[PDB]
Amino acid sequence: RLYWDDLKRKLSEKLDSTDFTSTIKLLNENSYVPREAGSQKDENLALYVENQFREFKLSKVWRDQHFVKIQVKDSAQNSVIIVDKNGRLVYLVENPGGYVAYSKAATVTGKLVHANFGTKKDFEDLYTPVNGSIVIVRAGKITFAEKVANAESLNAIGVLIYMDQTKFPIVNAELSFFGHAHLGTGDPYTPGFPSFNHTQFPPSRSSGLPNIPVQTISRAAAEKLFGNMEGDCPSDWKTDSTCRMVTSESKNVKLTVSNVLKEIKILNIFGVIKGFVEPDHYVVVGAQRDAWGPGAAKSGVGTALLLKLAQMFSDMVLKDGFQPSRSIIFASWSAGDFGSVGATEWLEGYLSSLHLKAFTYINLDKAVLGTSNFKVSASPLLYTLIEKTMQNVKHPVTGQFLYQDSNWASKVEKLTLDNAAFPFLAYSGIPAVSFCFCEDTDYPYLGTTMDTYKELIERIPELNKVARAAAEVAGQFVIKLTHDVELNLDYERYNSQLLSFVRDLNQYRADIKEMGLSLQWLYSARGDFFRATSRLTTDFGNAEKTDRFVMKKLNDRVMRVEYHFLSPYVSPKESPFRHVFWGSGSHTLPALLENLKLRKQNNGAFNETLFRNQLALATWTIQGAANALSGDVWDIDNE
Amino acid sequence: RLYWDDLKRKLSEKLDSTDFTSTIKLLNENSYVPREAGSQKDENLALYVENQFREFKLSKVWRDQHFVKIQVKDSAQNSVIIVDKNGRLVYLVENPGGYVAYSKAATVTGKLVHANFGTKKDFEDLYTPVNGSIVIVRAGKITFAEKVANAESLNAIGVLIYMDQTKFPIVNAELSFFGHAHLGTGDPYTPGFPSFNHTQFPPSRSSGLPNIPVQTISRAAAEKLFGNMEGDCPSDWKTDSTCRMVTSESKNVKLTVSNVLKEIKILNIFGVIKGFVEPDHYVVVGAQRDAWGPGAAKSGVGTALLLKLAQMFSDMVLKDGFQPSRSIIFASWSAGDFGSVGATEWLEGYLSSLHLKAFTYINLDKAVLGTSNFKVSASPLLYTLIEKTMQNVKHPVTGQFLYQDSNWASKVEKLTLDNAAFPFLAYSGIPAVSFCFCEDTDYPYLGTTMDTYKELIERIPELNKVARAAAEVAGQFVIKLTHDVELNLDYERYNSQLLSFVRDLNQYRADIKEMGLSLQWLYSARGDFFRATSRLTTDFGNAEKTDRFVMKKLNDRVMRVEYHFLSPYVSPKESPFRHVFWGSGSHTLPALLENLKLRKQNNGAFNETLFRNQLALATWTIQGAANALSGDVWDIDNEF
Amino acid sequence: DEEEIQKAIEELLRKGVSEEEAAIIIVQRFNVAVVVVVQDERQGKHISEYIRRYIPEADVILFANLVVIKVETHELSTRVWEAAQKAY
Amino acid sequence: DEEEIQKAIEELLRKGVSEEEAAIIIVQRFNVAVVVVVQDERQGKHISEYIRRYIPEADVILFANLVVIKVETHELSTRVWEAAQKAY
Ligand SMILES: *[C@@H]1O[C@H](CO)[C@@H](O[C@@H]2O[C@H](CO)[C@@H](O[C@@H]3O[C@H](CO[C@H]4O[C@H](CO)[C@@H](O)[C@H](O)[C@@H]4O)[C@@H](O)[C@H](O[C@H]4O[C@H](CO)[C@@H](O)[C@H](O)[C@@H]4O)[C@@H]3O)[C@H](O)[C@H]2NC(C)=O)[C@H](O)[C@H]1NC(C)=O
Ligand SMILES: *[C@@H]1O[C@H](CO)[C@@H](O[C@@H]2O[C@H](CO)[C@@H](O[C@@H]3O[C@H](CO)[C@@H](O)[C@H](O)[C@@H]3O)[C@H](O)[C@H]2NC(C)=O)[C@H](O)[C@H]1NC(C)=O
Ligand SMILES: *[C@@H]1O[C@H](CO)[C@@H](O[C@@H]2O[C@H](CO)[C@@H](O)[C@H](O)[C@H]2NC(C)=O)[C@H](O)[C@H]1NC(C)=O
Ligand SMILES: *[C@@H]1O[C@H](CO)[C@@H](O[C@@H]2O[C@H](CO)[C@@H](O)[C@H](O)[C@H]2NC(C)=O)[C@H](O)[C@H]1NC(C)=O
Ligand SMILES: *[C@@H]1O[C@H](CO)[C@@H](O[C@@H]2O[C@H](CO)[C@@H](O)[C@H](O)[C@H]2NC(C)=O)[C@H](O)[C@H]1NC(C)=O
Ligand SMILES: *[C@@H]1O[C@H](CO)[C@@H](O[C@@H]2O[C@H](CO)[C@@H](O)[C@H](O)[C@H]2NC(C)=O)[C@H](O)[C@H]1NC(C)=O
Ligand SMILES: [Ca+2]
Ligand SMILES: [Ca+2]
């Protein structure tokens, strides 16, 4: 029999004998490039991954076939033009090679106002209003969809996105790039339900689709526009010197976007290594396969890591006697640049089949972007698992352990809309984890035509060792979640997550006292959840691990923790991100805090009735999670 | 060790040694007779039930306190008046004693049009339009809430409900009665969430609340109104000869309702006998305790059956060595005639704790209303069980087995809004069952002050043996749901259900092809569900019943069948009855069929966009249930 | 208790309440059987004597063009209503 | 081609399209650098000769009070744009 100390050294020894640069630059050949969603080369790479899964002698390989509507450029060229002197002077700024998917096809003419990164606080700290004008924004900080939503909320008629040289130091300055403006995930025309032929594709439009045109432009076109506008950009923004603010008096900008929808067939490839004790429970390891350009950083590294992890685990189970108690699923997704279309539609299709079976998701997308920092975003249940993993995995260049900051958990940022783990965590209620070796600045070539293998190996010479470290982190994650009778999910991690929330809410106690309300029941629910976690820990400690009955009874209560945080009072179709902690909508705790923060201004932006309903529903969501983790229904106490 | 054949006749021997009429007429003593929801005598009866549960030495006895808003009469009397000659002739018709809770407090004046029972077909087959007029209807067929909703949908300004002598043969022509008109369950001011102090009771109103006044009147007042009306009521209604249709041209009716809201504290009493093998899984046996009047037929019989079943099962566990594998929960609810307030609020409060633990609910309300027929409304998963209980339980009077019709399953009516098992089945996805020894006519004294023990023992002389037979049915249900390693839940039954649905849908093939759609994927979904049921049956057959882990895993696969039929695309707060088969809303299969009907009519009623989304979500709901029942996600082998 | 009904009718008529809604308020407050609004007091006396002749068990009182008839049974209530309809 | 642009402008101007939106359509369809709508042919000659004097690398064509200037680099495009702004 093998224990953790042997599995770890076996995984490390197999990692030392594996080359990742070869597989990456093979995925960067002239077969497979470029691989847009639904393209022929994406299908070729899907078939290659499927046949490689077959070669690894996995327990079972299969495929899912979806038909989704994406958006592409039309025969008519998108245009950015400058008009002057009441339309008697026209100036072609750019015919961009890139575009923003799911943008509304229209033409709009008006003034161009700069809004920095397009965040809500950026629009708040602006003197020039953007109502009925086009907005120029630089990329970064938030997703394209968030920028377009924040602009459209203030009656902006158009959005232009560029890359400044200060945050994106690119020599070319005429490079085009690609993104999507859908404020959500999955096929925006099958919102909440899968994209299969069974649905017969009824008329359904996601509310996350924008109703204003958004277009990407190069830095050359951005500076060309800057040459026709006035006002110095604030030094707080840290942008180029050529930056300007608002167009001239008589100068207007005309933006013409003519993108068209296209129905395509995407393929999700899957392999599974069945468990030896509890095969019905499993971890899912996914990676995006498609990419607008070459996509070496985002999709190539992830797909190579997926292939090599599958190969190594199959070799361990077939030749080295590794016997996981629970199953392992390796998934190659498609259409990952229009949101998380493949993964989200797969979740929406088989949601009832993986309800309380799939218990962890590990995303491998964009895992190698630098060598300075090791960043991670995950559900609290995995925090400890991450911590114990950072204490015994060495840095690729410095040679030291990844665990250096003892307060890393207090600095973890939550998953964002562009990450494929976000629909796994906020929609399906499955704990998900994404990690990356990156830098303090964004990878400049993401979404561009220069996201190639040569530009990636030149920026990262030790790419093999960094990819090996990322694969080692992922492999230790997989082993810790499958090899032992105890699942390494730390429920107590949520206690602090609750303890902060109420405390934040307590900072507005006076408001709570002015509306005749009280926070005592939220404190009661938090304490009940804390005591339930403590009782569960003590029962785990007092139970014999060889008794399968009691162990499964406890693990079922462990695997229900993340599900009980999904809001049971909202529609999963019109509000799929149901998680009260990491979701999106008025049902989340951050939304409750946002609403309550508006009362003291006394302007009519605070909705008290909405706030009371939010308080009630969130309080009882926390209390129901606590009562479900407590145990049987007849062991709950009342006043 | 004990087997089923021993437990059967031991339960029977305890049934023969149990007296039910004693406890019934004890619950009908002046210490408890008028137990309105939240009253003092309701609280005393709850205390008596709790002390009796403690005396039986159950595994645990506890209680839940809810604070809910009901509606009660005001100091000002509700009035029905007739005015004529431009208000120069005033005629007092009635100051009724009963009322309809959750009615809108208002005063309306206008014409009075008879609409039979107030069903949608009654309003459709009507010559006189009811828009802007008051509607008088007869009690029966549907609930009060359905009548008021169907009236308000056609712009009716008021509703009057009475009891005709043909349908309700009562001598007292001035007897009052009580009802409620909330199109839903639970506290209508905490819709979708429990009625606890933790919620702090935010301003939220259920959409099922009516916006027109509705008042109950006696037969004398109804005939007095008919004396001022014209037109003979159609012979298809089978009503009294004094029935009339429409008031005179110059005569109008004034209805004044002034009911007021009242916040009350309701108590739900619970006892639990813990299991010996799988104590975390359990069935729930409930019974309404409160009533507007004496409530001997509705709540008294149910509470007596609950007490006696608890006592007998506790005796079998403590004295006869009966070891249930799974737990048993006996529940006495409150506020059971204002909807299903107690049980619905309990479900909304502890839904996360009963997700995949509570696997069957057995309702005891109104189980003894007659001796002629034995009626049953339940989820198909219990059908087989019910059948297996009708083949070895004898009739209290005829002495023959209850299983006489071999095609009873094709004649089963679905649970209705007034039944307490409806929120258990349609909202929480728990298989539920309701049964009753009744007659072909409704019990006339339900909801009246004449629902006493004397009238019940006069109408049913052998009340003791009929109550014993009902308790035997419930006890056999519990025993076959608790004693063995198999739950005796027949999933294959749902196959038949699906086979019905698609069949009806085939009747509209010409329309489906006319919209450019196809039914092949729904055919494939039905076939895949059949295949999944067959695979689960073979897995049960090939697994050895002594392996508790594999058996519990298969039973976990079984306990997810009813849950996977809850629509995952609607809001459980604003559409709680999510069950696509037995729920309510545009997400159900009957709603899909009713909407598709209008395709042939070619008028504006058919919403093609809605139908396309309905067909898509319903098709994948069935396909998702089949894929989940098949097994693991990687073992789904079907042509996609 | 005829004179309290009379006081109520008088005080309601002085507040600006018309005769018809005053009759409605009277039948709502005192639970009387029938109220008749007449044009003059000769017709009032005529209708009151008619009701007294054909329903002698009824209590009939006349005040300010309002005829209030009170009975305690439903047969006599319907008889009073029909007599008021016929003699109106 | 000069003749192609001339025929397109002719067909568009005869159709009822105004000069400004016609210039917008021209720059959308032919990928030209700058287009200037002038009041008369005097301004046309002036601006055309000015742009050809200060930017000899530009391809300038005049037709129906519309001066279309086509260049193939961004610096020369900015030069042509500034010259057209100054000469207008
Ligand atoms: C959870 O939520 C429920 C529903 O909102 C709350 O229940 C209400 O709680 C309030 C506050 O305790 C109750 O109001 C108080 O009720 C007392 C009950 O006394 C009864 O008996 C006396 C005779 O002995 C009667 O006169 C009285 O009408 C009652 O029938 C009253 O005694 C209280 O009056 C005193 O306090 C008030 C101010 O609170 C003063 O104005 C009075 O002069 C007097 O000093 C008061 O009326 C209310 O009745 C409860 N409703 C129900 C339906 O139970 C729960 O309190 C809440 N729980 C928690 C923990 O917050
Ligand atoms: C499931 O739905 C998808 C999408 O609706 C179907 O794919 C589509 O199938 C049709 C008919 O087979 C294709 O149309 C045909 O295209 C060819 C050109 O390749 C043309 O010559 C024909 O006249 C016809 O128009 C359509 O291209 C295709 N779309 C995609 C994106 O592949 C699929 O067939 C459906 N599957 C089943 C089993 O119904
Ligand atoms: C953006 O909003 C402002 C609102 O002030 C508009 O400015 C004008 O403001 C005056 C008030 O001093 C109003 O009387 C005018 O009606 C406003 N103009 C219009 C067109 O509504 C400003 O015009 C708005 N900009 C756009 C593009 O709509
Ligand atoms: C405050 O929030 C409530 C609830 O979100 C809003 O009430 C809804 O308003 C819309 C449009 O007015 C209606 O269609 C809904 O039916 C309302 N919901 C109800 C009644 O439950 C309310 O409009 C918000 N107020 C403001 C000023 O934004
Ligand atoms: C019920 O609805 C009908 C139809 O709308 C009403 O009858 C019409 O009333 C309008 C006045 O609003 C007249 O102009 C039409 O001539 C009427 N049509 C017919 C066929 O008579 C009717 O008044 C409504 N009833 C009530 C009580 O409001
Ligand atoms: C037909 O059904 C559709 C879908 O249920 C209805 O569309 C809704 O319309 C309201 C009113 O504008 C919107 O608030 C909803 O968001 C729409 N939902 C969808 C899914 O589109 C439509 O109104 C119905 N039409 C009729 C005549 O009943
Ligand atoms: Ca979607
Ligand atoms: Ca409720």
Coordinates of N, CA and C in Angstrom, one line a residue, chain A residues 60 62 192-194 196-200 202-204 272 274 278-280 282 327 329 346 348-350 352-353 355-356 517-518 521 548-549 552-553 560 563-564 568-573 609 612-613 615-617 619-620 623-624 627-628 632-636 638-639, chain B residues 60 62-64 192-194 196-200 202-204 272 274 279-280 282 327 329 348-350 352-353 355-356 517-518 521 548-549 552-553 556 560 563-564 568-573 609 612-613 615-617 619-620 623-624 627-628 631-636 640:
Chain A
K60 N -12.0 5.7 -19.1 CA -13.0 5.9 -20.2 C -12.8 7.3 -20.8
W62 N -14.5 10.1 -23.7 CA -15.7 10.4 -24.4 C -15.7 11.9 -24.8
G192 N -28.9 29.5 -19.1 CA -29.4 28.7 -18.1 C -29.7 27.3 -18.5
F193 N -29.7 27.0 -19.8 CA -30.0 25.6 -20.3 C -29.0 25.3 -21.3
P194 N -28.7 24.0 -21.5 CA -27.6 23.6 -22.4 C -27.9 23.9 -23.8
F196 N -27.9 22.0 -26.7 CA -28.1 20.7 -27.4 C -29.2 20.9 -28.4
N197 N -29.3 19.9 -29.3 CA -30.4 19.8 -30.3 C -31.7 19.5 -29.6
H198 N -31.7 18.9 -28.4 CA -32.9 18.6 -27.7 C -33.7 19.8 -27.4
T199 N -33.1 20.9 -27.0 CA -33.8 22.1 -26.7 C -34.4 22.8 -28.0
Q200 N -34.0 22.4 -29.2 CA -34.5 22.9 -30.4 C -34.2 24.4 -30.5
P202 N -34.7 27.5 -28.6 CA -35.8 28.5 -28.6 C -35.3 29.9 -28.5
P203 N -36.1 30.9 -28.8 CA -35.6 32.3 -28.7 C -35.4 32.7 -27.2
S204 N -34.1 32.8 -26.9 CA -33.8 33.2 -25.5 C -32.5 34.1 -25.6
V272 N -11.6 10.0 -18.1 CA -11.9 9.7 -16.7 C -11.1 8.5 -16.2
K274 N -11.3 6.0 -13.2 CA -12.3 5.7 -12.2 C -11.6 5.4 -10.9
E278 N -14.8 4.9 -4.1 CA -15.9 5.7 -4.3 C -15.8 6.4 -5.7
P279 N -16.1 5.6 -6.8 CA -15.9 6.2 -8.1 C -16.9 7.2 -8.5
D280 N -18.0 7.3 -7.8 CA -19.1 8.2 -8.2 C -18.7 9.6 -7.8
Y282 N -15.8 12.7 -7.8 CA -14.7 12.9 -8.7 C -14.3 14.4 -8.6
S327 N -12.7 9.3 -8.3 CA -12.4 9.3 -9.8 C -11.7 10.7 -10.1
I329 N -11.4 13.4 -13.5 CA -11.9 13.8 -14.8 C -11.0 14.9 -15.4
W346 N -21.6 22.6 -20.5 CA -21.4 21.3 -19.9 C -22.0 21.2 -18.5
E348 N -24.5 23.2 -17.4 CA -25.9 23.3 -17.6 C -26.5 22.1 -18.1
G349 N -25.8 21.3 -18.8 CA -26.3 20.1 -19.4 C -26.4 18.9 -18.4
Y350 N -25.4 18.7 -17.6 CA -25.3 17.6 -16.7 C -25.3 18.0 -15.3
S352 N -27.8 18.0 -13.1 CA -28.4 17.0 -12.2 C -27.5 15.7 -12.0
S353 N -26.6 15.4 -12.9 CA -25.8 14.3 -12.8 C -24.5 14.5 -11.9
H355 N -24.6 16.7 -9.2 CA -25.1 17.6 -8.2 C -24.2 17.5 -6.9
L356 N -24.1 16.3 -6.3 CA -23.3 16.1 -5.2 C -22.3 15.0 -5.4
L517 N -34.3 47.4 13.0 CA -33.8 46.1 12.7 C -32.7 45.7 13.7
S518 N -32.2 44.5 13.6 CA -31.1 44.0 14.5 C -30.3 43.0 13.7
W521 N -29.6 38.0 14.7 CA -29.8 36.7 14.1 C -28.7 36.4 13.1
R548 N -16.4 2.6 6.9 CA -16.9 3.3 5.7 C -18.2 4.0 5.9
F549 N -19.1 3.4 6.7 CA -20.4 3.9 7.0 C -20.3 5.3 7.5
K552 N -18.5 8.0 5.2 CA -19.3 8.4 4.1 C -20.4 9.4 4.6
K553 N -20.9 9.1 5.8 CA -21.9 9.9 6.4 C -21.4 11.3 6.7
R560 N -21.7 18.9 1.1 CA -22.9 19.8 1.0 C -22.6 21.2 1.4
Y563 N -22.7 23.7 -1.6 CA -24.0 23.7 -2.2 C -25.0 24.6 -1.4
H564 N -24.9 24.5 -0.1 CA -25.8 25.2 0.8 C -25.6 26.7 0.8
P568 N -31.1 29.7 -2.6 CA -32.3 28.9 -3.0 C -33.6 29.8 -3.3
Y569 N -33.4 31.1 -3.3 CA -34.6 32.0 -3.5 C -34.5 32.7 -4.9
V570 N -33.6 32.4 -5.7 CA -33.4 33.1 -7.0 C -33.6 32.0 -8.1
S571 N -33.9 32.5 -9.3 CA -34.0 31.7 -10.5 C -32.6 31.3 -11.0
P572 N -32.3 30.0 -11.1 CA -31.0 29.6 -11.6 C -30.8 29.9 -13.1
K573 N -31.9 30.1 -13.8 CA -31.8 30.5 -15.2 C -31.5 32.0 -15.5
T609 N -36.8 48.4 1.2 CA -37.6 47.1 1.1 C -36.7 46.0 0.5
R612 N -34.3 45.0 3.1 CA -34.9 44.1 4.1 C -35.1 42.7 3.6
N613 N -35.5 42.6 2.3 CA -35.6 41.2 1.8 C -34.2 40.6 1.6
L615 N -31.6 41.1 3.5 CA -31.2 40.8 4.8 C -31.8 39.5 5.3
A616 N -33.2 39.4 5.1 CA -33.9 38.2 5.5 C -33.4 36.9 4.8
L617 N -33.3 37.0 3.4 CA -32.9 35.9 2.7 C -31.5 35.4 2.9
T619 N -29.7 36.1 5.8 CA -29.7 35.5 7.1 C -30.2 34.1 7.1
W620 N -31.3 33.8 6.5 CA -31.8 32.4 6.5 C -31.0 31.5 5.6
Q623 N -28.3 30.6 8.0 CA -28.8 29.8 9.1 C -29.2 28.4 8.6
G624 N -29.6 28.3 7.3 CA -29.9 27.0 6.8 C -28.7 26.1 6.5
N627 N -27.7 24.9 9.9 CA -28.5 23.8 10.4 C -28.3 22.5 9.6
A628 N -28.1 22.6 8.3 CA -27.8 21.4 7.6 C -26.4 20.8 8.0
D632 N -28.9 16.1 12.1 CA -30.3 15.8 11.9 C -31.2 17.0 12.1
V633 N -32.4 17.0 11.6 CA -33.3 18.1 11.7 C -33.8 18.3 13.1
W634 N -33.9 17.2 13.9 CA -34.4 17.2 15.2 C -33.4 17.6 16.3
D635 N -32.2 18.0 15.9 CA -31.2 18.5 16.8 C -30.9 20.0 16.7
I636 N -31.9 20.7 16.2 CA -31.8 22.2 16.1 C -32.5 22.8 17.3
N638 N -34.2 26.2 19.3 CA -34.9 27.4 19.1 C -35.1 28.1 20.5
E639 N -35.3 29.4 20.4 CA -35.6 30.2 21.6 C -37.0 30.1 22.1
Chain B
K60 N -37.2 11.4 20.5 CA -37.1 12.8 20.8 C -38.4 13.5 20.5
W62 N -40.0 17.5 20.3 CA -39.6 18.9 20.2 C -40.7 19.7 19.6
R63 N -40.5 21.0 19.4 CA -41.5 21.9 18.9 C -40.9 23.1 18.1
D64 N -41.7 23.7 17.2 CA -41.2 24.8 16.5 C -42.3 25.9 16.6
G192 N -42.1 31.9 0.1 CA -40.8 31.3 -0.3 C -39.8 31.2 0.8
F193 N -40.0 31.9 1.9 CA -39.0 31.8 3.0 C -39.7 31.6 4.4
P194 N -39.1 31.1 5.4 CA -39.8 30.7 6.6 C -40.3 32.0 7.4
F196 N -39.9 33.1 10.5 CA -39.1 33.1 11.8 C -38.7 34.6 12.1
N197 N -38.3 34.8 13.3 CA -37.7 36.1 13.7 C -36.4 36.4 13.1
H198 N -35.7 35.4 12.5 CA -34.4 35.6 11.9 C -34.6 36.5 10.6
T199 N -35.7 36.3 9.9 CA -36.0 37.1 8.7 C -36.4 38.5 9.0
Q200 N -36.8 38.7 10.3 CA -37.3 40.0 10.7 C -38.5 40.5 10.0
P202 N -39.7 40.9 6.5 CA -39.7 42.1 5.5 C -41.0 42.2 4.8
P203 N -41.2 43.4 4.2 CA -42.5 43.6 3.4 C -42.5 42.8 2.1
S204 N -43.2 41.6 2.1 CA -43.3 40.8 1.0 C -44.7 40.2 1.0
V272 N -40.1 12.0 17.2 CA -39.3 11.2 16.3 C -38.9 9.9 17.0
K274 N -36.1 7.2 16.3 CA -34.9 7.1 15.5 C -34.8 5.7 14.9
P279 N -30.6 6.2 10.5 CA -31.4 7.1 11.2 C -31.5 8.5 10.5
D280 N -30.5 8.8 9.7 CA -30.6 10.1 9.0 C -31.6 10.3 7.9
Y282 N -35.6 9.5 6.8 CA -36.9 9.4 7.5 C -38.1 9.7 6.6
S327 N -35.7 6.5 10.3 CA -36.5 7.1 11.3 C -37.9 7.4 10.9
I329 N -41.0 10.3 11.8 CA -41.3 11.7 12.3 C -42.8 11.8 12.3
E348 N -40.1 25.3 4.3 CA -39.3 26.5 3.8 C -38.2 26.8 4.8
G349 N -38.4 26.4 6.1 CA -37.3 26.7 7.1 C -36.3 25.6 7.1
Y350 N -36.6 24.4 7.0 CA -35.7 23.3 7.1 C -35.5 22.5 5.8
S352 N -33.0 22.8 3.6 CA -31.7 22.3 3.5 C -31.4 21.1 4.3
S353 N -32.1 20.8 5.4 CA -31.9 19.7 6.2 C -32.7 18.4 5.7
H355 N -33.2 17.8 2.3 CA -32.9 17.8 0.9 C -33.0 16.4 0.4
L356 N -32.2 15.5 0.8 CA -32.2 14.1 0.4 C -32.2 13.2 1.7
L517 N -40.8 22.4 -35.7 CA -40.3 21.7 -34.5 C -40.4 20.2 -34.7
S518 N -39.9 19.4 -33.8 CA -40.0 17.9 -33.8 C -40.0 17.4 -32.4
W521 N -36.7 14.3 -30.0 CA -35.9 14.3 -28.8 C -36.6 14.0 -27.6
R548 N -24.5 -3.3 2.8 CA -25.3 -2.0 3.1 C -24.8 -0.8 2.3
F549 N -23.5 -0.8 2.0 CA -23.0 0.4 1.2 C -23.6 0.5 -0.2
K552 N -27.3 1.2 0.1 CA -27.6 2.6 0.4 C -27.3 3.5 -0.8
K553 N -26.3 3.2 -1.6 CA -26.0 3.9 -2.8 C -27.1 3.8 -3.8
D556 N -29.9 5.9 -2.6 CA -29.6 7.3 -2.8 C -29.9 7.7 -4.3
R560 N -33.3 10.4 -5.4 CA -33.1 11.6 -6.2 C -34.1 11.7 -7.4
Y563 N -36.7 14.5 -6.8 CA -36.0 15.8 -6.8 C -35.7 16.2 -8.2
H564 N -35.3 15.3 -9.0 CA -34.9 15.7 -10.4 C -36.0 16.1 -11.3
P568 N -35.5 23.1 -12.5 CA -34.3 23.9 -12.1 C -34.2 25.2 -12.8
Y569 N -35.2 25.7 -13.5 CA -35.1 26.9 -14.3 C -36.1 28.0 -13.8
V570 N -36.7 27.8 -12.7 CA -37.7 28.8 -12.1 C -37.2 29.1 -10.7
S571 N -37.7 30.2 -10.2 CA -37.4 30.7 -8.9 C -38.2 30.0 -7.8
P572 N -37.6 29.3 -6.9 CA -38.3 28.6 -5.8 C -39.1 29.6 -4.9
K573 N -38.7 30.8 -4.9 CA -39.4 31.8 -4.0 C -40.7 32.3 -4.7
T609 N -43.5 32.0 -28.6 CA -42.2 32.2 -27.9 C -42.2 31.4 -26.6
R612 N -42.0 27.6 -27.2 CA -40.7 27.1 -27.6 C -39.8 27.0 -26.3
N613 N -39.8 27.9 -25.4 CA -39.0 27.8 -24.2 C -39.6 26.7 -23.3
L615 N -41.2 23.9 -24.2 CA -40.8 22.6 -24.8 C -39.3 22.3 -24.6
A616 N -38.4 23.3 -24.7 CA -37.0 23.1 -24.5 C -36.7 22.8 -23.1
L617 N -37.2 23.5 -22.1 CA -36.9 23.3 -20.7 C -37.5 22.0 -20.2
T619 N -38.2 19.3 -22.1 CA -37.5 18.2 -22.7 C -36.2 17.9 -22.0
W620 N -35.5 18.9 -21.7 CA -34.2 18.7 -21.0 C -34.3 18.3 -19.6
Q623 N -34.8 14.7 -19.9 CA -33.5 14.1 -20.3 C -32.5 14.2 -19.2
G624 N -32.5 15.2 -18.4 CA -31.6 15.3 -17.3 C -31.9 14.3 -16.2
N627 N -30.6 11.0 -17.5 CA -29.2 10.9 -17.4 C -28.7 10.7 -16.0
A628 N -29.3 11.4 -15.0 CA -28.9 11.3 -13.7 C -29.3 9.9 -13.1
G631 N -26.8 6.7 -14.1 CA -25.6 6.4 -13.3 C -24.6 7.5 -13.3
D632 N -23.3 7.2 -13.5 CA -22.3 8.1 -13.6 C -22.4 8.9 -14.9
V633 N -21.8 10.1 -14.9 CA -21.9 11.0 -16.0 C -21.1 10.4 -17.2
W634 N -20.1 9.7 -17.0 CA -19.3 9.1 -18.1 C -19.9 7.8 -18.6
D635 N -21.0 7.3 -18.0 CA -21.7 6.1 -18.4 C -23.0 6.4 -19.2
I636 N -23.2 7.6 -19.7 CA -24.4 8.0 -20.4 C -24.1 7.7 -21.9
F640 N -26.6 11.6 -29.1 CA -26.8 13.0 -28.9 C -26.9 13.7 -30.2

